[PDB]
Amino acid sequence: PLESQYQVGPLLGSGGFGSVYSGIRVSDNLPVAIKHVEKDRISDWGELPNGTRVPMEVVLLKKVSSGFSGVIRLLDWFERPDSFVLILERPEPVQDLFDFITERGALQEELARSFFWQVLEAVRHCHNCGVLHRDIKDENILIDLNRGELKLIDFGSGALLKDTVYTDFDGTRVYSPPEWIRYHRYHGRSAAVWSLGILLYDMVCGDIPFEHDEEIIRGQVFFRQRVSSECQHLIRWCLALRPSDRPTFEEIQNHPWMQDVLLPQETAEIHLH
């Protein structure tokens, strides 16, 4: 029933996470994304309520796909003999944040503020649902160009959120916190906050701040672009070397740089139309 119910289109991307294609649901023409993951490259499995053996990515997406949020929702999935196939929402028109920043350079603060806010809301939603993403970064964020709405996408390195230490990590190194680099240990929330400080820097400078391990551990941030004294302050706070000196989500969202955010729609009117 998979190749009857969806019409496949062009490849949208491929890499660590598999191959993803543009698609349409025949039933009604909903734009969808069709993501293929090979069984052999799943290191990490879980089980659903009714109790079958699936990729953790499917468990996590089901836990966050309830109601509306800034997470791309899992509409359906399928098992094949050597792969799983996931059917996801697909906004239209869309551009991932990596390509957006690649095309336009450093974002104006007003736009970064709007985008960063929506990321924080999506991450809180995930954490609320008991899910840790663990690979928050520009290429895992989609922008709906018409509504100005951001959507988080690739849960393949994620895990159930817990309050004890994690000793495995599979996201992107250059977004990984110094405690991971040095001790191979981190807690979920505070590692997520570090990745958010890398993301924010990336947004307002048009590039990531750290490339090598020794830079991460040293944790000294330099601005190549004219940035406010406040935005800088928030970024250096998220990027505190000690996990316990990092802000909580609440404290990020109450920081002075985060006041007077634009709503998504006005964001797209001003910056994306």
Ligand X SMILES: Nc1ccc(NCCNCCO)c2c1C(=O)c1c(O)ccc(O)c1C2=O
- State the nearest-atom distance from the C-beta of 145 to ligand X, in Å: 9
- State the nearest-atom distance from the C-beta of 35 to ligand X, in Å: 6
- State the nearest-atom distance from the C-beta of 16 to ligand X, in Å: 10
Binding mask 90-129 for ligand X (x = CB under 6 A): x---xxx--x------------------------------
- Tell me the residue number closest to ligand X, measured at CB: 13
Choose the catalytic residue: 135, 138, 144, 202: 135
φ, ψ of residue 224 to 5 degrees: the values are -95, -10
From 58-66, 87-95, 121-129, 249-257, span contacting ligand X (CB under 6 A): 87-95
Q: Is 15 annotated as a binding residue?
A: yes
Q: Among 33, 61, 126, 136, which residue interacts with ligand X (rule: CB under 6 A)?
A: 33
- State the nearest-atom distance from the C-beta of 92 to ligand X, in Å: 8
Nearest CA to 270 out of 94, 108, 96, 103 is that of: 108
* Furthest-apart CA atoms within the chain: distance in Å: 56
| 245 noted as active-site residue | no
| Interface positions with ligand X (CB under 6 A) | 12-13, 20, 33, 35, 72, 88, 90, 94-96, 99, 142, 153-154
Binding residues for ATP: 12-20, 35, 89, 96
By annotation, the residues acting in catalysis are 135
